[PDB]
Design a protein around this ligand. Structure first.
Ligand SMILES: CN(C)c1ccc(-c2cc(=O)c3ccccc3o2)cc1
Ligand SMILES: [Zn+2]
Lengths: 47, 161
């Protein structure tokens, strides 16, 4: 894995073109996330 | 040491997790190539992941980050989609779960949009889709996402397309 930028603990990818997109995030240490919920699902075919 | 506790659909915690799943679906610029064509999900199950060692590993690091950032962990709840969800819930996140070719470098990636994490359930770009039908837009096969507690601390802001 890479390192966080110096002086930072993560990176935030801010959308700059697609007005409707939410942010995405990157961490560089596995210990910085806990998998709290497992969600089992299907995608639904639009009508 | 992992146990999975099923949540009832009647449980407020089930309902708030489902609402975050459903309400953060968006359209994708690939027209559904990676993740499939859909506007909503059929939620089949929501389980709480309970592992004391992994939790303590998380809280230890969270405190370190917090102390480096004016007592602010900048903790979020975010989606992660991966072929390795079963390894993650048993052994935790580590470098094997990183997106080596990601646009922000080799790290572990999370999304506010559940539909963004859905694009990674079968691999990068959706891989070859579901194992049974080789369909990235399979409506039959059961998929899994993680909804994760993530410490951001001081986050480097990248403006990006
Ligand atoms: C190569 N492997 C193990 C993975 C696993 C998960 C992901 C993944 C999972 C995500 O949920 C995600 C969310 C926003 C942006 C990128 C994302 O990437 C990528 C590569
Ligand atoms: Zn299938």
């Amino acid at each position: 894995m890479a390192h966080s930028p110096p002086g930072h603990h993560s990176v935030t990818g801010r959308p700059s073109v697609n007005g409707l997109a939410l942010a995405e995030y990157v961490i560089y240490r596995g210990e910085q996330a806990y998998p709290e919920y497992l969600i089992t699902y299907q995608i639904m075919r639009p009508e | 040491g992992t146990i999975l506790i099923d949540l009832s659909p009647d449980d407020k915690e089930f309902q708030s997790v489902e609402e975050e799943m459903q309400s953060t679906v968006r359209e994708h610029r690939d027209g559904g190539h990676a993740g499939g064509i859909f506007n909503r999900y059929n939620i089949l199950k929501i389980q709480k992941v309970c592992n004391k060692k992994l939790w303590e590993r998380y809280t230890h690091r969270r405190k370190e980050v917090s102390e480096e950032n004016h007592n602010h962990a900048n903790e979020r709840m975010l989606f992660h989609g991966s072929p390795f969800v079963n390894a993650i819930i048993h052994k935790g996140f580590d470098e094997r779960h990183a997106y080596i070719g990601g646009m922000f470098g080799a790290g572990i990636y999370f999304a506010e949009n559940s539909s963004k994490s859905n694009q990674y359930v079968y691999g990068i770009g959706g891989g070859t889709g579901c194992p049974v039908h080789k369909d990235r837009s399979c409506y039959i096969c059961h998929r899994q996402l993680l909804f994760c507690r993530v410490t951001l601390g001081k986050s480097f802001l990248q403006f990006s397309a």
